[PDB]
Design a protein around this nucleic acid. Sequence first.
DNA 1: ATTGAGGCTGGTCATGGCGCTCATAAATCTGGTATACTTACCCACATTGGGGCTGATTCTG
Length: 50
Amino acid sequence: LMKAVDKFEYRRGYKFSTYATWWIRQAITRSIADQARTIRIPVHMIETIN
DNA sequence: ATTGAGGCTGGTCATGGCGCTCATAAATCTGGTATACTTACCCACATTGGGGCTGATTCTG
């Protein structure tokens, strides 16, 4: 959310929630793919497994 | 107890598969950005310590 706030633009006329949701979900998924296993697995291989 | 030959001590010449080193390259590993709108989870005992009384000696109106 802080990262999304750092790059939000209000001139487009869209609400902040639509822009912030993408960043929040991307950060959450990246964290899950990074630090949720005892043995680290790369993001591309995690995506292939999914 | 000598001088005439064999077996065995010195080095020749490369030789040959092995190992360390250079370089190429596609597969693997990292960082990055997405714009209709989504807003508060889900058993039974014994002992010591803390907090609320319970008088019981000091002082009071």
